[PDB]
């Protein structure tokens, strides 16, 4: 341990300066377009499923999983268990709820979570989309209020490209005009998917309720009336200025 | 991360070739109904050809003893002298 945060000790990881082509080398392989290919039979077409057809397999290799804390120079905590799955779950979680906007700045955190994957420096929003169905992962933005979640549930071969996808949403999201409008659709349908929760629906009359127009008792939701106003992309980089930052 | 963005990039450099691809297996798709279109051409086309390439056309099956009895031409219903 080369660092103690919050009462947690973290090991240091350092910035390194490693060239574009011999970095490229390491990212996992894979294909958009098959414009041609080797034709070959399917060598099983005639196995039953009963019969067993893998043999001289390497033997297993198992590890009691244990939990490894790290750090970045710019103040990112990295937290991550190996219970030797094959498929991995990456989520990156930012301190930044419902629970610090200001009555003035009602829902900007859900509209964050609507903004999610959307273009960034070196993406568009379509390309970034396509590379998560491409690949076979799934996930999403889930804003609370506290924290703000995005999450990717992947095969864990492709991990380095999961992880910069995601990543990209808080280092350098293009919030441009014209995206951001079109989002304005999911406040609509976050409150009927909150709604039709019973239990949940429920839950949220109680904080408002509990927490008389503060922290805790803040919508999670955006209304659709006049909070549409700083629906903005301007409006939601100054908060993501406010709070968003590697050390949260 | 750079080099992520690299690949992502780079894996539609070959858009053209992928589309001519494409375009190439959907004429492929379609070349089995040359088995149909070829025969029914020469099928419509049959009368306009002369007698011999008729006979050759046919490998000999038909010839002009296999014109009918009542000739469209009833001057040649038999052969090009008639019957006798
Ligand atoms: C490995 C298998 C090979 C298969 C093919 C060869 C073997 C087949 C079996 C044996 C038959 C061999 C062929 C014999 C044909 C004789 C026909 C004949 O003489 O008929 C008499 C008729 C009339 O001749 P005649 O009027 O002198 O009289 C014949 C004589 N009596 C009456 C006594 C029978 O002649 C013809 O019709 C000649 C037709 C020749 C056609 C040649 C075609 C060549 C290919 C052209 C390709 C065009 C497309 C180009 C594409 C370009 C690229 C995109
Ligand atoms: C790579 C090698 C490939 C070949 C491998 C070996 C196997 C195949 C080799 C075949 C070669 C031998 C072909 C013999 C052709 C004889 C033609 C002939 O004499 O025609 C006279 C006929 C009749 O001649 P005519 O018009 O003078 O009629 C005279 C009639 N009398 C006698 C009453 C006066 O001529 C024609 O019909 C002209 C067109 C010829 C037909 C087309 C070319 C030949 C096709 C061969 C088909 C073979 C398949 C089996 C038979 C199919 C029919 C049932
Ligand atoms: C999707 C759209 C489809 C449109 C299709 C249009 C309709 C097509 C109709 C097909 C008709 C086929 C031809 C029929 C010919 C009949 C032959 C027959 O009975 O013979 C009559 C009689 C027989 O005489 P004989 O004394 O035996 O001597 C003749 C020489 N041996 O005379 C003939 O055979 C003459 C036949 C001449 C046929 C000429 C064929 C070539 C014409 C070229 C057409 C080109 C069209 C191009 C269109 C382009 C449009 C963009």
């Known amino acids: 341990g080369k660092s103690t945060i919050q009462g947690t000790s973290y090991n240091v990881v350092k910035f390194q300066q490693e060239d574009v082509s011999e970095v490229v080398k390491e990212v996992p392989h894979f294909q958009f377009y098959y414009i041609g290919g080797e034709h070959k039979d399917n060598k099983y077409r005639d196995v039953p499923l009963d019969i067993p057809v893998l043999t001289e397999a390497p033997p297993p290799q198992l590890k009691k999983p244990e939990m490894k804390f790290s750090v970045l120079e710019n103040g990112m905590r990295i937290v ?15 301190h930044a ?23 960034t420096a070196h993406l568009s929003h379509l390309r ?14 889930q804003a609370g209020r506290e924290h703000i979640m995005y999450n990717l549930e992947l095969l864990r071969e492709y991990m380095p490209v999961a992880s910069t996808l995601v990543v990209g949403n808080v280092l350098f999201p293009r919030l441009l005009p014209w995206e951001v409008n079109a989002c304005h659709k999911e406040i609509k349908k976050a409150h009927e998917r909150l709604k039709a929760d019973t239990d949940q629906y429920v839950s949220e009359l109680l904080h408002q309720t509990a ?38 | 991360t750079l080099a992520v963005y690299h690949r992502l990039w780079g894996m539609t450099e070959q858009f053209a070739a992928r589309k001519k691809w494409g375009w190439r297996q959907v004429y ?26 008729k006979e050759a056309m046919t490998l000999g099956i038909w010839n002009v003893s296999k014109r009918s009895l009542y000739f469209w031409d009833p001057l040649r219903s038999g052969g090009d002298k008639g019957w006798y």
Request: aromatic letters at 12%; charged letters at 20%.
């Open chain 2, 28 to 53: 492929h798709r379609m070349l089995p109904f040359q088995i149909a279109l070829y025969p029914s051409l020469m099928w419509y086309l049959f009368g306009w050809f002369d007698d011999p390439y």
């Open chain 1, 128 to 141: 970034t989309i396509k590379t998560i169905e491409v690949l076979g992962m799934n996930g999403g933005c």
């Open chain 1, 80 to 94: 991550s268990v190996d219970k030797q799955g094959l498929t991995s779950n990456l989520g990156l979680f930012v």
């Open chain 1, 97 to 119: 709820g419902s629970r610090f906007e200001t009555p003035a700045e009602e829902g900007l955190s859900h509209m964050v979570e609507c903004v999610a994957f959307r273009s």
């Open chain 1, 211 to 248: 927490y008389h127009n503060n922290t805790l008792g803040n919508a999670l939701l955006a209304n659709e009336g006049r909070a549409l106003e700083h629906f903005t992309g301007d409006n939601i980089r100054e908060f993501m200025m406010k709070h968003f930052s590697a050390e949260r």
